[PDB]
Design an enzyme around this catalytic site. Structure first.
Site, PDB file in Angstrom:
ATOM      1  N   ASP A  14       0.837  -1.184   0.000  1.00  0.00           N
ATOM      2  CA  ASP A  14       0.000   0.000   0.000  1.00  0.00           C
ATOM      3  C   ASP A  14       0.876   1.239   0.000  1.00  0.00           C
ATOM      4  O   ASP A  14       1.962   1.258   0.585  1.00  0.00           O
ATOM      5  CB  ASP A  14      -0.959   0.060   1.197  1.00  0.00           C
ATOM      6  CG  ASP A  14      -1.980   1.186   1.063  1.00  0.00           C
ATOM      7  OD1 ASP A  14      -2.565   1.325  -0.021  1.00  0.00           O
ATOM      8  OD2 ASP A  14      -2.195   1.936   2.037  1.00  0.00           O
ATOM      9  N   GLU A  16       0.621   5.646   0.463  1.00  0.00           N
ATOM     10  CA  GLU A  16      -0.039   6.936   0.610  1.00  0.00           C
ATOM     11  C   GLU A  16       0.729   7.950  -0.233  1.00  0.00           C
ATOM     12  O   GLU A  16       1.911   7.758  -0.547  1.00  0.00           O
ATOM     13  CB  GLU A  16      -0.102   7.393   2.070  1.00  0.00           C
ATOM     14  CG  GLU A  16      -0.676   6.379   3.044  1.00  0.00           C
ATOM     15  CD  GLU A  16      -2.092   5.903   2.709  1.00  0.00           C
ATOM     16  OE1 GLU A  16      -2.448   4.786   3.170  1.00  0.00           O
ATOM     17  OE2 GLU A  16      -2.839   6.624   2.002  1.00  0.00           O
ATOM     18  N   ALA A  17       0.053   9.036  -0.606  1.00  0.00           N
ATOM     19  CA  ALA A  17       0.644   9.998  -1.523  1.00  0.00           C
ATOM     20  C   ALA A  17       0.020  11.369  -1.294  1.00  0.00           C
ATOM     21  O   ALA A  17      -0.813  11.559  -0.402  1.00  0.00           O
ATOM     22  CB  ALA A  17       0.465   9.541  -2.975  1.00  0.00           C
ATOM     23  N   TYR A 125      -3.899   2.719  -9.459  1.00  0.00           N
ATOM     24  CA  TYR A 125      -3.233   3.711  -8.631  1.00  0.00           C
ATOM     25  C   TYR A 125      -1.849   3.271  -8.176  1.00  0.00           C
ATOM     26  O   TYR A 125      -0.847   3.830  -8.637  1.00  0.00           O
ATOM     27  CB  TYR A 125      -4.111   4.050  -7.416  1.00  0.00           C
ATOM     28  CG  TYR A 125      -3.626   5.251  -6.644  1.00  0.00           C
ATOM     29  CD1 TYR A 125      -4.036   6.530  -6.989  1.00  0.00           C
ATOM     30  CD2 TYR A 125      -2.742   5.104  -5.571  1.00  0.00           C
ATOM     31  CE1 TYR A 125      -3.588   7.640  -6.284  1.00  0.00           C
ATOM     32  CE2 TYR A 125      -2.289   6.201  -4.862  1.00  0.00           C
ATOM     33  CZ  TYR A 125      -2.708   7.467  -5.228  1.00  0.00           C
ATOM     34  OH  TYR A 125      -2.269   8.549  -4.521  1.00  0.00           O
ATOM     35  N   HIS A 188      -6.137   4.363   6.011  1.00  0.00           N
ATOM     36  CA  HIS A 188      -5.382   5.386   5.291  1.00  0.00           C
ATOM     37  C   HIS A 188      -4.010   5.660   5.906  1.00  0.00           C
ATOM     38  O   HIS A 188      -3.457   6.761   5.745  1.00  0.00           O
ATOM     39  CB  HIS A 188      -6.197   6.676   5.188  1.00  0.00           C
ATOM     40  CG  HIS A 188      -7.541   6.480   4.556  1.00  0.00           C
ATOM     41  ND1 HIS A 188      -7.700   6.162   3.225  1.00  0.00           N
ATOM     42  CD2 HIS A 188      -8.788   6.545   5.080  1.00  0.00           C
ATOM     43  CE1 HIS A 188      -8.989   6.049   2.953  1.00  0.00           C
ATOM     44  NE2 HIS A 188      -9.670   6.277   4.061  1.00  0.00           N
ATOM     45  N   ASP A 193      -3.451  -0.181   6.271  1.00  0.00           N
ATOM     46  CA  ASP A 193      -4.192  -0.654   5.113  1.00  0.00           C
ATOM     47  C   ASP A 193      -3.613  -1.955   4.569  1.00  0.00           C
ATOM     48  O   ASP A 193      -4.364  -2.783   4.046  1.00  0.00           O
ATOM     49  CB  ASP A 193      -4.206   0.429   4.037  1.00  0.00           C
ATOM     50  CG  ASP A 193      -5.185   1.563   4.355  1.00  0.00           C
ATOM     51  OD1 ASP A 193      -5.996   1.420   5.302  1.00  0.00           O
ATOM     52  OD2 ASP A 193      -5.144   2.599   3.660  1.00  0.00           O
TER      53      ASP A 193
HETATM   54  N1  AMP Z   1     -10.395  12.055  -1.013  1.00  0.00           N
HETATM   55  C1  AMP Z   1      -9.116  11.926  -1.311  1.00  0.00           C
HETATM   56  N2  AMP Z   1      -8.569  13.151  -1.499  1.00  0.00           N
HETATM   57  C2  AMP Z   1      -7.264  13.265  -1.817  1.00  0.00           C
HETATM   58  N3  AMP Z   1      -6.488  12.134  -1.944  1.00  0.00           N
HETATM   59  C3  AMP Z   1      -7.052  10.909  -1.753  1.00  0.00           C
HETATM   60  C4  AMP Z   1      -8.352  10.775  -1.438  1.00  0.00           C
HETATM   61  N4  AMP Z   1      -8.625   9.417  -1.314  1.00  0.00           N
HETATM   62  C5  AMP Z   1      -7.469   8.737  -1.552  1.00  0.00           C
HETATM   63  N5  AMP Z   1      -6.507   9.663  -1.826  1.00  0.00           N
HETATM   64  C6  AMP Z   1      -5.084   9.503  -2.156  1.00  0.00           C
HETATM   65  O1  AMP Z   1      -4.825   8.152  -2.442  1.00  0.00           O
HETATM   66  C7  AMP Z   1      -3.783   7.654  -1.577  1.00  0.00           C
HETATM   67  C8  AMP Z   1      -4.051   6.189  -1.331  1.00  0.00           C
HETATM   68  O2  AMP Z   1      -5.322   5.971  -0.738  1.00  0.00           O
HETATM   69  P1  AMP Z   1      -5.530   4.864   0.389  1.00  0.00           P
HETATM   70  O3  AMP Z   1      -4.574   3.667   0.205  1.00  0.00           O
HETATM   71  O4  AMP Z   1      -6.987   4.362   0.233  1.00  0.00           O
HETATM   72  O5  AMP Z   1      -5.422   5.605   1.747  1.00  0.00           O
HETATM   73  C9  AMP Z   1      -3.833   8.577  -0.369  1.00  0.00           C
HETATM   74  O6  AMP Z   1      -2.622   8.615   0.355  1.00  0.00           O
HETATM   75  C10 AMP Z   1      -4.191   9.923  -0.989  1.00  0.00           C
HETATM   76  O7  AMP Z   1      -3.055  10.585  -1.525  1.00  0.00           O
HETATM   77 MG    MG Z   2      -3.726   3.445   2.307  1.00  0.00          MG
HETATM   78 MG    MG Z   3      -4.239   2.062  -0.913  1.00  0.00          MG
END
Ligand code: AMP
Ligand code: MG
Ligand code: MG
Ligand code: AMP
Ligand code: MG
Ligand code: MG
Ligand code: NA
Ligand code: NA
Ligand code: NA
Lengths: 227, 229
Positions: A14, A16-17, A125, A188, A193
């Protein structure tokens, strides 16, 4: 017969970004959790309905890294991840750089081959973004011998082909709560995750391994998210 | 007021599992590193109340946890308390302590701001000498030659004795300290990641005094003598 043989190591992934794809985002956190196929095959099979959350395998390789981006985080990203450029820079995190590529290579090379990355929404992604980050380095990508699959497609098959044209949500949290009637923890965050993903992949561990063996494709074929 | 090696910028909480006690000439079976910037410790809430709550770990941490195939079997007690065995590590394809692991550790360390100090419970008599022994077998130069190290047993002894004046005999095992401070049982004891997190928690008890003690007692890892040859 399987296109690339039996995967010996699954690496749950996983990221984050700084934001969503149209923002040309940069990685702020990365977690890899390497699990031998035999650790999955030894998972206890579900105890009725709802089954308990499986326990993680004892023998696991884990890598979790925070990474300073070259651009600010979107407000929406910082809001949910708890990360920002300021948090990462004040704590001296380095950029996604050549040394990181070397670290990833050495981590991968400790796993029995072939290895397959497993990430939720990886095809849209995580994999394209990682490809973009690695492509701008001088070090060659350490992932050009590694395979990958998206756990969304995996859990769709394991749910549909084993139990009504009704749509179901395939967000990471929706799957977890549908399978185990329990809220995920530490959402997140990269590591939180990844552990949630591991739990849902332990639901039907031998079915999941088979599906992975059948759908694993080379990571080198992943198109970068942006140039 | 004149530190030996400056302010430590990164604390790397470190724990190892291995095949047994020092008399058995043990080999490492599991390694966990948890790198925390000193500002995360400067910005930890000090403990008040009785019992204080277990501190929150920092949001920003680097973690590396690796299982390692040993060249000899685990002792029965070591195997039971750690949940690891040589046979199971081998069927799960774990590699031995080798050159590539040194490269991994080197790259992990280089991502941390310097100067950097390992923190390990009983590190001075066990973890650090055992790691020195493992690294000595390799053809690669030690990835720790520029890193500092301290033992948290001495640290918590200093911290606890300053927080209640003299004049009894207390255990300074990792678990005894944790339960004394927080009135909670540790989780995942005798696993490298579990014990590293428990160590982080006891080090966050008095985080400013811990940082000062560490700054004052940090010493080069290169000076650690191998456990055995
Ligand atoms: N509503 C959102 N707004 C901005 N970035 C998001 C959003 N949802 C997911 N992301 C981006 O997607 C990355 C991966 O999502 P996750 O693994 O589901 O936490 C996050 O670290 C965010 O950079
Ligand atoms: Mg995540
Ligand atoms: Mg993710
Ligand atoms: N009570 C114990 N009995 C036998 N071996 C132990 C014991 N405590 C620690 N060890 C050994 O020392 C290693 C490190 O200790 P620890 O970090 O406290 O788990 C273990 O993996 C065992 O090999
Ligand atoms: Mg220990
Ligand atoms: Mg331990
Ligand atoms: Na990059
Ligand atoms: Na199954
Ligand atoms: Na303090």
């Amino acid at each position: 017969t399987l296109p690339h043989g039996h995967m010996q190591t699954l690496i749950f992934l996983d990221l984050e970004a700084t934001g969503l794809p149209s923002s040309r985002p940069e990685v702020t956190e990365l977690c890899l959790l390497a699990v031998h196929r035999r650790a999955l095959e030894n998972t206890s099979i579900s105890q009725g309905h709802p089954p308990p959350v499986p326990r993680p395998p004892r023998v696991v390789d884990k890598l979790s890294l925070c990474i300073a981006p070259g651009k600010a985080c979107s407000p929406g990203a910082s809001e949910i991840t708890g990360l920002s450029k300021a948090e990462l820079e004040v704590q001296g995190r380095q950029r996604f750089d050549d040394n990181l590529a070397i670290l990833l290579r050495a981590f991968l090379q400790r796993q029995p081959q072939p290895c397959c990355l497993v990430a939720h929404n990886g095809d849209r992604y995580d994999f394209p973004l990682l490809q973009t980050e690695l492509a701008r380095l001088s070090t060659p990508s350490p992932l050009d011998g590694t395979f990958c699959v998206d756990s969304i497609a995996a859990l769709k098959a394991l749910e549909q082909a084993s139990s009504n044209g009704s749509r179901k949500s395939y967000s990471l949290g929706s799957i977890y709560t549908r399978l185990y009637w329990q809220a995920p923890t530490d959402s997140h965050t990269a590591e939180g995750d990844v552990l949630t993903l591991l739990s849902i992949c332990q639901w039907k561990p031998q079915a999941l391994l088979q599906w992975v063996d059948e759908h694993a494709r080379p990571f080198s074929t992943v198109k970068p998210m942006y140039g």
